[PDB]
Design a protein around this ligand. Structure first.
Ligand SMILES: *[C@@H]1O[C@H](CO)[C@@H](O[C@@H]2O[C@H](CO)[C@@H](O)[C@H](O)[C@H]2NC(C)=O)[C@H](O)[C@H]1NC(C)=O
Ligand SMILES: *[C@@H]1O[C@H](CO)[C@@H](O[C@@H]2O[C@H](CO)[C@@H](O)[C@H](O)[C@H]2NC(C)=O)[C@H](O)[C@H]1NC(C)=O
Ligand SMILES: *[C@@H]1O[C@H](CO)[C@@H](O)[C@H](O)[C@H]1NC(C)=O
Ligand SMILES: *[C@@H]1O[C@H](CO)[C@@H](O)[C@H](O)[C@H]1NC(C)=O
Lengths: 99, 50
């Protein structure tokens, strides 16, 4: 090439990571404020509540109630963390030991 | 903002002096799909509301 002054695009910056902020429309279901209830029903008259139209996750749940196991069925345990269901229906009762 | 089963002749009723009728603009004891739900607070001693 000839003698001259040339303007060259040198790559200098690149975005490292992202910041995400969004205000929620619906409220928190607070499942764990129900699963830590005092009056636990017995296996004859178990209760059920239908948590619908709210927001939830799993990590604050399963560390705020003292879990000993969490299996699943017809599901994969990481398919909870993404999706948006239509309702959740938690039914709890106590356990008699030998059965 | 929901999917409300709205009645035919919808109306409300004040809750300081109860009227003859009752608040009947939906019979929707089925918790329908709600795209939005929220609560806000305003002044009880205000003159106008825009
Ligand atoms: C645990 O569940 C019971 C429901 O069995 C909740 O009991 C309610 O308590 C309030 C207290 O003001 C009563 O007015 C309601 O009538 C009760 N509900 C029923 C169905 O009886 C209790 O509040 C729950 N615990 C927590 C911490 O929410
Ligand atoms: C918005 O405020 C209204 C009125 O304060 C709430 O309606 C009450 O909800 C409780 C719990 O479901 C009932 O026990 C009361 O009888 C309701 N009052 C009336 C006048 O309906 C409503 O739950 C609030 N909404 C949110 C999303 O917090
Ligand atoms: C309003 O509702 C109450 C309770 O369901 C009922 O007893 C009353 O008769 C109703 N009022 C009218 C005008 O129907
Ligand atoms: C609005 O509320 C404030 C206190 O929260 C009060 O000082 C004021 O008088 C209220 N507005 C009117 C028009 O009364």
């Amino acid at each position: 090439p000839n003698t001259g002054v040339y303007d060259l695009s040198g790559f200098t910056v690149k975005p490292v990571a992202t910041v995400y902020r969004r205000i929620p429309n619906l409220p928190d279901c607070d499942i764990d404020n129900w699963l830590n209830n005092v009056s636990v029903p017995s296996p004859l008259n178990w209760e059920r509540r239908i948590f619908s139209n709210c927001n939830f996750n799993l990590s604050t749940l399963l560390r705020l109630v003292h879990v000993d196991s969490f299996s699943c069925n017809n599901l994969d345990k990481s398919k909870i963390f993404g999706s948006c269901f239509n309702s959740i229906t938690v039914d709890k009762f106590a356990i008699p030991n030998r059965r | 903002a929901c999917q409300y089963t709205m009645c035919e002749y919808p109306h409300t009723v004040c809750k300081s002096k109860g009227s003859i009728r009752n608040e009947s603009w939906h019979i929707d004891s089925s918790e329908p799909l709600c795209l939005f739900k929220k609560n806000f607070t305003y002044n009880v001693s205000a003159d106008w509301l825009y």
